[PDB]
Amino acid sequence: KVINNCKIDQCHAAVTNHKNWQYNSPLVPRNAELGDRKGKIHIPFPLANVTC
Amino acid sequence: ENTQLSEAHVEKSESCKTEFASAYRAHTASASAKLRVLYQGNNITVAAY
Numbered sequence: 001k002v003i004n005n006c007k008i009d010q011c012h013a014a015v016t017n018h019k020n021w022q023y024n025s026p027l028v029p030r031n032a033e034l035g036d037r038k039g040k041i042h043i044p045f046p047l048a049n050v051t052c
Numbered sequence: 053e054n055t056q057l058s059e060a061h062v063e064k065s066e067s068c069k070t071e072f073a074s075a076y077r078a079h080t081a082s083a084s085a086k087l088r089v090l091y092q093g094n095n096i097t098v099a100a101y
C-alpha cells in the first residue's frame with residue numbers, strides 16, 4: 001500500500017496471523033485478558049532413590 | 053496512559069513425595085527380651101515380652 005501526505009514517525013506496524021503455539025514465559029506479554037489454552041507438555045527426568 | 057497487571061501465588065513442590073520430614077507424638081513403650089539357658093547339658097533359647 002501507499003499513504004498520501006502521511007509522514008513517518010506517525011505510523012505503526014505488526015504481524016498478526018499465527019499458526020503455531022508458544023510457551024507462556026513471564027518475559028513476554030499476554031495477547032488477551034483471558035488466555036486461550038491449547039495444550040501441554042511434560043517435564044522429564046524424575047527422582048529416585050540410590051546409594052553413594 | 054498505559055498500565056501493567058501482575059499476580060502470583062504459592063503451591064506445593066512435586067519432590068515432596070521423596071524428600072520430607074515428619075513430626076510425631078510419643079506415648080508409653082513396651083519391652084521384649086531374649087535369653088540363653090544351659091539346661092541338662094544343652095543350650096536352649098527363649099523369647100518373650
Ligand SMILES: *[C@@H]1O[C@H](CO)[C@@H](O)[C@H](O)[C@H]1NC(C)=O
Nearest residue numbers: 047048049050069070071072
Ligand atoms: C524411596 O522412594 C520412595 C518414593 O519413590 C520414598 O517413599 C522413600 O522414602 C524413599 N526412600 C529413601 C530411603 O529415600
Ligand SMILES: *[C@@H]1O[C@H](CO)[C@@H](O)[C@H](O)[C@H]1NC(C)=O
Nearest residue numbers: 088089090091093094095096
Ligand atoms: C553351647 O553349649 C556349650 C557346652 O556344651 C558351650 O560351651 C557353648 O558356649 C554354648 N553356646 C553358646 C553360644 O554359649
